[PDB]
Scaffold this active site. Structure first.
Site, PDB file in Angstrom:
ATOM      1  N   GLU A   1       4.853   5.827  11.441  1.00  0.00           N
ATOM      2  CA  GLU A   1       3.404   5.654  11.526  1.00  0.00           C
ATOM      3  C   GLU A   1       2.966   4.778  12.700  1.00  0.00           C
ATOM      4  O   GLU A   1       1.901   5.011  13.278  1.00  0.00           O
ATOM      5  CB  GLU A   1       2.845   5.101  10.226  1.00  0.00           C
ATOM      6  CG  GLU A   1       2.749   6.135   9.120  1.00  0.00           C
ATOM      7  CD  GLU A   1       2.483   5.533   7.760  1.00  0.00           C
ATOM      8  OE1 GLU A   1       2.029   4.367   7.698  1.00  0.00           O
ATOM      9  OE2 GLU A   1       2.676   6.255   6.744  1.00  0.00           O
TER      10      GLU A   1
ATOM     11  N   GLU B   1       0.823  -1.232   0.000  1.00  0.00           N
ATOM     12  CA  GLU B   1       0.000   0.000   0.000  1.00  0.00           C
ATOM     13  C   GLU B   1       0.853   1.277   0.000  1.00  0.00           C
ATOM     14  O   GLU B   1       0.546   2.235  -0.723  1.00  0.00           O
ATOM     15  CB  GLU B   1      -0.953   0.000   1.194  1.00  0.00           C
ATOM     16  CG  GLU B   1      -2.244   0.772   0.977  1.00  0.00           C
ATOM     17  CD  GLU B   1      -2.408   1.908   1.966  1.00  0.00           C
ATOM     18  OE1 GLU B   1      -1.714   2.940   1.787  1.00  0.00           O
ATOM     19  OE2 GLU B   1      -3.186   1.753   2.943  1.00  0.00           O
ATOM     20  N   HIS B   2       1.960   1.237   0.746  1.00  0.00           N
ATOM     21  CA  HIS B   2       2.943   2.317   0.779  1.00  0.00           C
ATOM     22  C   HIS B   2       3.746   2.449  -0.513  1.00  0.00           C
ATOM     23  O   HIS B   2       4.306   3.526  -0.779  1.00  0.00           O
ATOM     24  CB  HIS B   2       3.912   2.099   1.921  1.00  0.00           C
ATOM     25  CG  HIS B   2       3.491   2.732   3.194  1.00  0.00           C
ATOM     26  ND1 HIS B   2       2.488   2.215   3.977  1.00  0.00           N
ATOM     27  CD2 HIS B   2       3.967   3.811   3.853  1.00  0.00           C
ATOM     28  CE1 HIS B   2       2.363   2.948   5.064  1.00  0.00           C
ATOM     29  NE2 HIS B   2       3.238   3.934   5.005  1.00  0.00           N
TER      30      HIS B   2
END
Ligand code: HEM
Ligand code: HEM
Ligand code: HEM
Ligand code: HEM
Lengths: 52, 105, 49, 54, 425, 61, 446, 54, 54
Positions: free
Chosen positions: G137, G60-61
């Site tokens: 994060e 996703e990153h």
């Protein structure tokens, strides 16, 4: 008095009626067993053993 | 308006005088029993009325204790007994009754 | 980083019907509550006597 | 005060034999005690409210 | 075939008393009705600051036609919502429910806005909510900055505070709310917008219940721009800072030029976790700054003024470098270093962005209402896109020119040891 | 036996606290008969003949 | 006049068409100048083993940082320049990539999505840059008490099953995950019969199907066979996780029983009861006059800062209950008042309040499906979880069915006399002992 | 600090007999509550000394 | 609200037998405190039925 008279309360009574019936059965059989109430206990098959 | 309606009013003035809270300087609404609707109505009173109410109750409890009464001139006159709690208490009961009508459906 | 926090293995203390990760615990919830409450019912029955 | 006097009537009748005047006025005071608490005093309170426009 | 019904057009009507009615029958399962009022924070004066905030919080209090309890219970019974959304100029009372239930919510809507009672005890009970409401908003460092930005910029109306000043909490009176409604909630300051409602019905209720006179006239005392800087020593890890100058009033051709310049320099992100390659300000800062930062073009338009510039989030030490990189980037656009494809990209960002902003009924209704109040008309998306297109590259450069050379307004919060004063930019 | 004896006992009688109390009360009655007499019967075997209930037929009228 | 029932019929049918490779292509055409296109993949963290728990999150990153056809900056620049917005998310069961764009830009949007999905250039220099970003994060997510408690709730409820894992993965997995680890996950999971190309807006369906054959074809030839990966069920455990931390100002509690899962018809009835209890927040205007008993008592007695009900859905399982944030002294009352509400509803629910819950839901469902992004999301997700798009008229039909008798039966099935999963964080000295929570799951009166 | 307030036993005595807020105006009719307590104690003390011989 | 906390009588029962914070680790040696209370009650109930005949 007049405040508890409405559709919701009739529903609320209907909802708790089987429960309040079953607590009556608990109270009755409870009282019958605790006093050895012969009048009612003469009817039940295995508990019948008390021949005068 | 009527001769007999002046008589109901004179019998009411009689009872008022017999009740005798006016002898202790009290107004009728001072003497009400404090329930939940009543507590709220007191709570809803403006500053000036609450403060006067407090003093009138204070004065009457003081008289009650010393077993005295006020001089005749200082008694609350039936004609000028201001029913200060009336609209407040009527509104609280109005609000309660609505809640209760709602709690029914 | 709070995602390192794994719950320790309880297989040692688990009832045999609650051992399988593949098996839903619902299929034995009745039988397990049933056993533990039967113990309670019988306890009360004995005390009532 | 009717209740206090009525109880004093019942007190008097309690310490008296069960003959002629005492049977009647005894049960008269008895019915009054219950009427005074159950019906009479709850009515006076309602009327007293009406008199104060309450 | 899986085709939709042919879309109906918006119905717009200016009543002779000044009141605007707009409606769109979109055939949606739910309905949305907004009463938009020229009653925002800018109509408060120094004697009654925060009155429009308490009023915003007061939408659920007893009205003549419905008690506090009735408004709450009646709306929830049908799963409805009642929201009041203030800005510096506007107050919008938006009601929302399924289409069978409009009539009930309309009645509630009309009561809240046209027959509130502001009961002494009810208002006293609500005062503590100003503290709660403010505390929750003010936990965004941006909120206090944009509040300080407006207080520094204007001497006047738009300087007003949106959230009630602390000293006025517990002090705003029932009479002040009565006076605020009586002289701001009037026909000529109002617009009734409907969605999933027929025009004859909205026109009916407006002619029956929204004919109110005896208020104030124009868009208030003309907001006087002043300039200056507000500084807040915070100890807040990062420094939030906003540089701004006077721009253009909403609706004008110049306003559109500022909106294109905003998209040239860079507004919000477009890609989830992105370097923002087309963001002029971001690239300009990133060249010189390597720590965590953010920068965006700030664009605020009002009825009689505007504020354009930029907003920065940076490490306390990096503050001066970020603001100076950002400012110099604007300076190059002012000097004429802007290409035609550059503007085209910004144009597409603004066009599509606007179109996306009115996609939902929540966003569509808010736009029609704001239009009705600001312009007295409805402007279709196709013609807004026409106005965006009309902006020449020179107009964008001139908008930059205007910012660089105009008296500045600044607001900053954090550890300000390395955050520059206007003096030093 | 397809769902467990305990599983069907919870479903029918242990779910509701009402039927739980009722099963205890009904179960207390039936337990008292089986126990009192059952323990008396065990008391008969360890005192065979020694008790008056065994002797009884010796002195009749 | 146009009635609410009539208006449900008016919304156009979602047109579903399947490609030859297994790619489901579904559209809801509307009148809008804009649209939302996206790919919904049946992949999350439940699909991941303990050794590769951060994978989906790592992909996703990387998904927007460069493809083989569009290196580095290229994707960002292309999407940005047409005014489009590019977004992604990963939940325990679903990964999604979607573009918010003009309808005339639909050809390009579909093309770009295909590149992200099939040709992700997982550059060695980038996966090294991304590991520092994800680690940051994780430190960021620690400060969100809400995100923590729900992660804990999954961890304790789904003890030693795939579902106990977080989407993000643990710190060890982020710093250890290799380039090969991510390609292996991508080849195993990003396969056509597990992908839905969903769209909503001013687009014809024929336009979309053309583009899917134009850009997504080339996932056939020969596929699956050797590795068929179907999800095994996840055992729910009645359990407690208590992270005592007296340095945090307010306590966070998430309490849940096992829910039935996506497909089950009685998710509708549970949601109605969850609406009756509802949600609260200290900024709500309602106060003492709020319909919901829990909400009204909570406002009056200042019993919390907020609460919210939830019905989190997974394949054949889920979490059903409430989360709240409150003062250290208010945890006991809050538990009591909530548990008592579950029980009231389980035994003694009433006709009127159930109609309100039905109405809130009708409103929740219609208000949610507003504009291209929510509808496109609903198309992608529903095709993965239900197999079809359930039309609004059917949802209404299934809502309308739910009387008081339904609520108390369905509530009893899931809530009455069950073991909850309890997650607690912050100043939690007053948080009830598990046995006492367990005791609040039944009534001695009933 | 005043030990009448802090001490667990004396706390009760203070709250019941010493620092209790009482109406300024209560009649001799409020005296019987304490008198009943005297009577209950009197009955316990005379009753016991009778029980030592009864 | 929980009536175990608010009600003046039940308040004591809650604070003494229900919600009282007790150590996790107390031995069977802590049981005798309750057992003494059972013994005092047992002695009162057997003692009285003896006093009815003694
Ligand atoms: C065992 C004998 C009793 C004792 C030791 C006792 C004790 C007392 C005491 C100390 C007070 C406070 C002082 C006062 O107001 O008198 C009081 C007040 C009160 N008692 Fe009793 N009492 C007993 C009998 C009763 C009975 C028989 C009733 C009702 C059938 C009663 C109902 C009340 C009430 C309502 C008050 C409140 C009076 C007030 O302050 O306005 N008590 N009691
Ligand atoms: C609730 C307070 C009490 C009341 C109202 C009460 C009432 C009475 C009455 C009416 C008599 C008969 C009077 C007579 O003919 O002389 C009596 C006698 C007796 N009482 Fe009590 N009493 C109380 C407390 C007690 C206590 C606590 C004891 C035990 C320590 C007790 C032990 C006796 C005995 C032994 C007698 C018989 C001797 C006698 O008649 O003088 N009393 N009591
Ligand atoms: C009339 C018989 C007594 C009763 C009914 C009684 C009651 C109890 C109870 C209920 C407890 C709490 C539970 C426990 O810790 O055991 C306790 C604890 C205690 N009792 Fe007693 N007790 C009595 C005799 C004694 C005696 C004779 C002593 C000292 C000579 C004593 C001193 C204590 C102490 C120091 C504790 C605290 C123990 C601890 O929690 O560490 N008590 N008592
Ligand atoms: C502090 C709790 C008590 C203790 C430790 C206690 C102790 C004793 C003892 C040691 C005996 C002699 C045992 C025997 O030879 O059978 C006795 C007998 C007696 N007790 Fe208590 N007792 C207590 C409570 C009471 C109470 C409350 C009553 C009055 C209701 C009472 C009335 C009697 C009587 C009448 C007897 C004589 C009958 C007999 O010996 O069995 N006892 N008690």
């Amino acid at each position: 008095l007049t405040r508890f008279l409405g559709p919701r309360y009739r529903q609320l009574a209907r909802n708790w009626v089987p429960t309040a019936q079953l607590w009556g059965a608990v109270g009755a059989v409870g009282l019958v067993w605790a006093t050895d109430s012969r009048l009612i206990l003469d009817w039940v098959p295995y508990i019948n053993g008390k021949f005068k | 308006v009527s001769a007999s309606s002046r008589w109901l009013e004179g019998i009411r003035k009689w009872y008022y005088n017999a009740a005798g809270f006016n002898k202790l300087g009290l107004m009728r609404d001072d003497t009400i029993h404090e329930n939940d609707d009543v507590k709220e109505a007191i709570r809803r009173l403006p500053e000036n009325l609450y403060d006067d109410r407090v003093f009138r109750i204070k004065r009457a409890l003081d008289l009650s204790m010393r077993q005295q009464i006020l001089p005749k001139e200082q008694w609350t006159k039936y004609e000028e007994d201001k029913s200060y709690l009336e609209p407040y208490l009527k509104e609280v009961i109005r609000e309660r009754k609505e809640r209760e009508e709602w709690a029914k459906k | 980083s709070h995602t390192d926090i794994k719950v320790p293995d309880f297989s040692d203390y688990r009832r045999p019907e609650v051992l399988d990760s593949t098996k839903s615990s619902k299929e034995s919830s009745e039988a397990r509550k049933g056993f533990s409450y039967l113990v309670t019912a019988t306890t009360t029955v004995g005390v009532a006597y | 005060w009717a209740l206090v006097a009525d109880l004093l009537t019942l007190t008097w009748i309690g310490g008296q034999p069960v003959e002629h005047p005492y049977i009647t006025i005894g049960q008269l005071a008895s019915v009054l005690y219950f009427l005074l608490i159950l019906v009479l005093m709850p009515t006076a309170g309602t009327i007293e409210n009406k008199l104060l426009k309450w | 075939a899986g085709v939709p019904p042919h879309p109906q057009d918006l119905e717009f009507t200016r009543l002779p008393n000044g009141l605007v009615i707009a409606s769109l029958e979109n055939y949606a399962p739910a309905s949305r009705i907004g009463l938009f009022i020229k009653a925002g924070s800018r109509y408060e004066n120094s004697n009654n600051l925060g009155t429009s905030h308490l009023l915003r919080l007061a939408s659920s209090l007893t009205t003549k036609g419905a008690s506090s309890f009735k408004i709450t219970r009646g709306i929830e019974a049908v799963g409805g919502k009642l929201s009041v959304t203030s800005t510096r100029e506007n107050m919008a009372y938006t009601v929302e429910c399924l289409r069978d239930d409009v009539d009930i919510l309309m009645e509630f809507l009309l009561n809240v806005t046209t027959a509130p009672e502001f009961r002494r005890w009810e208002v006293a009970a609500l005062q503590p909510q100003l503290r709660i409401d403010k505390a929750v908003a003010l936990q965004n460092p941006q909120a206090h900055v944009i509040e300080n930005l407006h207080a520094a910029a204007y001497r006047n109306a738009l300087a007003n505070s949106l959230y009630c000043p602390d000293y006025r909490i517990g002090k705003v009176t029932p009479v002040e709310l009565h006076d605020y409604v009586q002289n701001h909630f009037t026909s000529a300051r109002m617009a009734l917008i409907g969605l999933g409602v027929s025009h004859p019905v909205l026109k009916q209720v407006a002619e029956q219940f929204l004919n109110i006179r005896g208020g104030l006239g124009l868009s208030g005392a003309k907001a006087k721009y002043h300039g200056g800087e507000i500084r807040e020593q915070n100890g807040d890890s990062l420094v939030h800072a906003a540089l701004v100058a006077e721009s253009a009033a909403i609706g004008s051709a110049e306003a559109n030029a500022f909106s294109v310049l905003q998209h040239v320099l860079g507004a919000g992100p477009h890609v989830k976790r992105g370097s923002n390659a087309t963001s002029s300000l971001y690239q300009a800062v990133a060249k010189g700054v390597h720590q965590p930062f953010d920068v965006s073009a700030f664009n605020a338009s009002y009825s009689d003024s505007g504020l354009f510039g930029f907003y920065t989030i940076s490490q306390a030490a990096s503050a001066g470098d970020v603001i100076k990189a950002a400012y110099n980037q604007v300076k190059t656009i002012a000097q004429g270093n802007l290409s035609n494809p550059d503007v085209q990209a910004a144009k597409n960002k603004l066009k599509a962005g606007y179109l996306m902003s009115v996609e939902s009924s929540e966003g569509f209704l808010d736009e029609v209402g704001s239009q009705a109040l600001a312009a007295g008309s409805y402007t279709p998306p196709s013609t807004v896109l026409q106005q965006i297109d009309a902006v020449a590259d020179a107009d964008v450069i001139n908008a930059a020119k205007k910012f660089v050379s105009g008296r500045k307004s600044m607001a900053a919060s954090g550890n300000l040891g390395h955050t520059p004063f206007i003096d030093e930019l | 036996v397809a769902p467990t004896l305990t599983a069907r006992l919870y479903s029918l009688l242990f779910r509701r606290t009402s039927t739980f109390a009722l099963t205890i009360v009904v179960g207390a009655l039936f337990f008292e008969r089986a126990f009192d007499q059952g323990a008396d019967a065990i008391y008969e075997h360890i005192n065979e003949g020694k008790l008056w209930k065994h002797i009884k037929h010796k002195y009749e009228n | 006049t146009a009635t609410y029932a009539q208006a449900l019929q008016s919304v156009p049918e979602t047109q579903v068409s399947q490609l030859d490779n297994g790619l489901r292509v579904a559209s809801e055409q509307s009148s809008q100048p804009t649209c939302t296109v996206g790919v919904w993949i049946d992949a999350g963290s439940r699909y991941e083993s303990e050794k590769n728990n951060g994978a989906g999150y790592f992909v996703e990153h990387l998904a927007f940082k460069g493809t083989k056809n569009r290196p580095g900056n290229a994707l960002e620049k292309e999407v940005e320049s047409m005014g489009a917005h590019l977004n992604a998310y990963s939940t325990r069961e679903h990964t999604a990539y979607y573009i918010k764009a003009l309808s005339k830009d639909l050809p390009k949007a579909v093309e770009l999505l295909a590149d992200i999905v099939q040709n992700c250039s997982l550059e060695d220099s980038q996966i090294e840059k991304e590991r520092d970003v994800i680690l940051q994060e994780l430190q960021e997510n620690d400060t969100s008490m809400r995100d923590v408690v729900f992660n804990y709730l999954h961890a304790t409820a789904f003890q030693g099953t795939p579902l106990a894992q977080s989407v993000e993965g643990p710190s060890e997995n982020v710093r250890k995950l290799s380039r090969a680890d991510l390609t292996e996950y991508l080849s195993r999971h990003y396969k056509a019969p597990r992908m839905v190309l969903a769209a909503a807006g001013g687009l014809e369906h024929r336009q979309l199907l053309d583009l899917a054959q134009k850009h997504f074809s080339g996932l056939s030839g020969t596929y699956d066979e050797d590795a068929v990966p179907t999800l095994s069920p996840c055992r729910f455990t009645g359990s407690q996780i208590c992270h005592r931390e007296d340095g945090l100002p307010l306590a966070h509690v998430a309490i849940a029983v096992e829910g039935p899962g996506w497909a089950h018809p009685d998710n509708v009835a549970l949601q109605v009861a969850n609406a009756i209890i509802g949600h609260y927040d200290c900024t709500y205007g309602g106060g003492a006059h709020l319909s919901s008993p829990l909400a009204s008592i909570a406002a009056t007695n200042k019993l919390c800062q907020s609460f919210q009900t939830f019905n989190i859905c997974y394949a054949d399982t889920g979490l059903l209950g409430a989360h709240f944030v409150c003062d250290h002294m208010s945890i006991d009352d809050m538990m009591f008042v909530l548990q008592g509400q579950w029980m009231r509803l389980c035994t003694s629910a009433t006709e009127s309040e159930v109609l309100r819950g039905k109405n809130l839901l009708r409103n929740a469902l219609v208000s949610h499906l507003d504009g291209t992004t929510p509808v496109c999301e609903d198309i992608g997700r529903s095709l993965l979880t239900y197999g079809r798009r359930i039309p609004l008229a059917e949802w209404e039909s299934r809502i309308a069915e739910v009387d008081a008798r339904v609520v108390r039966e369905v509530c009893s099935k899931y809530f009455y006399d069950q073991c909850p999963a309890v997650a607690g964080f912050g100043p939690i000295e007053q948080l009830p002992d598990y046995n006492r929570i367990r005791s609040g799951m039944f009534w001695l009166r009933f | 600090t005043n030990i009448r307030k802090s001490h667990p036993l004396m706390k009760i005595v203070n709250n019941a007999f010493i620092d209790l807020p009482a109406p300024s105006n209560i009649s001799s009719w409020w005296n019987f509550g304490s008198l009943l307590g005297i009577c209950l104690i009197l009955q316990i003390l005379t009753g016991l000394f009778l029980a030592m011989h009864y």
